[PDB]
Amino acid sequence: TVLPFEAMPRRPGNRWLRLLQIWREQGYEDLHLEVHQTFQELGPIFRYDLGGAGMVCVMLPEDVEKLQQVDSLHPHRMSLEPWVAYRQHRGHKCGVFLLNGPEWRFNRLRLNPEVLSPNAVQRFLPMVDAVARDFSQALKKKVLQNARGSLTLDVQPSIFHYTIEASNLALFGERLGLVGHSPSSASLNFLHALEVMFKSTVQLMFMPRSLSRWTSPKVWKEHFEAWDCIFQYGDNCIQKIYQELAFTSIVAELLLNAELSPDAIKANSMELTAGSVDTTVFPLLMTLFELARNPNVQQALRQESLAAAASISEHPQKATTELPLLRAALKETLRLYPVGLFLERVASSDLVLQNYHIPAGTLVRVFLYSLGRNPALFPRPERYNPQRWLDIRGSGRNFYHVPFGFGMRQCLGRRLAEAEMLLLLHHVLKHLQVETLTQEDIKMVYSFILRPSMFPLLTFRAI
Ligand code: HEM
Ligand SMILES: N#Cc1ccc([C@@H]2CCCc3cncn32)cc1
Numbered sequence: 001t002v003l004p005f006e007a008m009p010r011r012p013g014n015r016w017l018r019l020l021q022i023w024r025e026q027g028y029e030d031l032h033l034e035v036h037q038t039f040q041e042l043g044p045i046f047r048y049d050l051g052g053a054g055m056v057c058v059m060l061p062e063d064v065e066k067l068q069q070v071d072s073l074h075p076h077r078m079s080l081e082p083w084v085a086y087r088q089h090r091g092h093k094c095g096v097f098l099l100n101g102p103e104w105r106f107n108r109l110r111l112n113p114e115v116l117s118p119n120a121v122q123r124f125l126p127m128v129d130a131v132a133r134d135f136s137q138a139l140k141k142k143v144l145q146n147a148r149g150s151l152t153l154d155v156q157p158s159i160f161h162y163t164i165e166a167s168n169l170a171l172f173g174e175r176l177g178l179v180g181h182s183p184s185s186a187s188l189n190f191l192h193a194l195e196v197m198f199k200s201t202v203q204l205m206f207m208p209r210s211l212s213r214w215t216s217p218k219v220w221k222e223h224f225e226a227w228d229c230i231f232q233y234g235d236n237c238i239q240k241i242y243q244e245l246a247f248t249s250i251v252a253e254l255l256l257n258a259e260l261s262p263d264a265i266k267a268n269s270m271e272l273t274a275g276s277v278d279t280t281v282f283p284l285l286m287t288l289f290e291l292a293r294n295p296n297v298q299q300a301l302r303q304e305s306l307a308a309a310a311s312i313s314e315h316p317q318k319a320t321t322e323l324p325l326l327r328a329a330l331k332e333t334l335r336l337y338p339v340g341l342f343l344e345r346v347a348s349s350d351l352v353l354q355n356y357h358i359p360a361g362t363l364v365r366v367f368l369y370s371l372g373r374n375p376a377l378f379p380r381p382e383r384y385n386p387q388r389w390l391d392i393r394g395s396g397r398n399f400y401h402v403p404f405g406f407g408m409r410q411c412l413g414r415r416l417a418e419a420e421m422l423l424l425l426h427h428v429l430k431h432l433q434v435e436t437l438t439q440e441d442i443k444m445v446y447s448f449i450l451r452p453s454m455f456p457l458l459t460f461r462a463i
Pocket of ligand 1: 077167272339342405
């Protein structure tokens with residue numbers, strides 16, 4: 001009863017013209033919408049032919065489960081060519097984000113204890129809480145410096161600085177000063193290189209290195225120069241940490257472990273640094289936006305955080321356990337606005353998705369934008385209702401929330417990202433109320449990650 005792979009519904013359109021249409025623009029900003037529309041038309045599975053190959057698109061938790069069942073010991077995710085190109089050119093190692101096969105697993109097993117283990121989280125969470133406190137106090141100060149105790153501003157830069165500040169402190173044990181009003185020029189240079197590296201990544205990742213090296217030599221120059229600044233900052237930090245180990249951070253533990261070479265430690269530390277760029281910031285912004293649009297949800301989160309403020313202050317780690325509604329609020333935000341638009345696996349072995357045979361080597365992509373909007377799973381999917389997550393009780397409900405991926409290749413920074421998001425929202429919601437003038441949905445664009453095209457100004461008010 002299993003249908004052949006070739007009988008799978010195909011998305012209409014010309015696979016070759018569409019690829020040229022992508023190169024015409026160095027982007028595919030409406031990917032989430034165009035895929036979402038196709039699901040509505042053809043069902044929960046279809047093939048998207050693009051150029052010489054394509055992708056099988058799915059959106060159901062049961063498909064995620066079947067994908068994790070055929071996860072080999074080395075789950076295969078396509079490497080990001082422009083990033084790999086820089087490593088080979090300069091002679092750097094590739095980290096877990098870019099690696100595949102045995103070398104990935106070798107690196108992964110020697111990183112999990114220092115990045116994901118409960119002991120690791122116990123270590124750096126008080127560090128993140130400190131940075132979150134600085135942000136909230138600085139913001140609360142600006143609000144009260146105002147005439148009416150109310151401030152309207154663009155919070156994306158400051159929140160983005162927070163995520164970089166907190167992550168860099170956990171990774172290298174150094175404060176960049178980005179939450180302060182006057183950071184050093186070195187810190188600003190580093191931050192600019194990160195932004196340029198991400199920008200140039202989008203410009204290059206949609207065509208082969210063979211071609212893009214002709215059509216855009218200056219983009220590659222910007223990309224490698226940005227990476228040079230990043231790896232230069234990483235070399236300095238790792239060297240400094242190493243010297244001081246002969247007389248507290250994630251890299252220090254990795255150096256003490258001595259399981260990975262200094263080059264491998266650096267490679268993974270740069271991909272962890274890159275991992276906090278244009279990721280954690282956006283769920284934070286979209287949560288604030290939705291809390292401004294749903295005052296009752298915001299007030300419920302404030303009562304929760306105010307009730308647990310004392311214990312959290314004594315033990316910051318309690319923010320990850322004693323704030324269940326805030327955790328649900330993050331699930332609801334990521335349900336509607338997943339950072340990673342899709343999860344990607346190259347089928348290591350044959351499998352069956354939606355009664356269709358999937359040959360080994362097929363590129364399968366789970367589109368979370370469509371997964372989270374399935375009404376049969378999230379009734380009234382357009383509604384921002386964090387309470388739904390305390391009530392879900394399906395047998396396979398652990399696959400309803402996979403914004404960080406699944407299996408052994410799941411986001412290595414998940415615990416760090418969750419800590420950063422929870423601690424910031426907790427400390428902000430304690431003393432401040434967020435409001436928005438516009439109540440309409442804002443547009444998202446797919447540019448490597450899913451982000452708002454133009455996040456609006458928000459108004460903060462003291463209680
Ligand atoms: C809301 C925030 C974030 C989301 C939604 C997110 C999402 C993801 C997803 C979907 C993957 C692919 C997992 C898979 O293929 O199964 C991934 C991988 C990864 N993420 Fe994140 N990420 C976030 C933040 C971060 C942060 C802050 C860091 C580092 C400080 C980070 C580091 C990594 C790394 C190193 C990998 C590669 C893991 C591997 O391939 O073994 N991420 N992330
Ligand atoms: N598949 C996939 C996939 C898509 C985007 C991302 C993003 C972007 C690159 C670095 C990063 C760290 N954490 C999340 N990300 C990660 C994975």
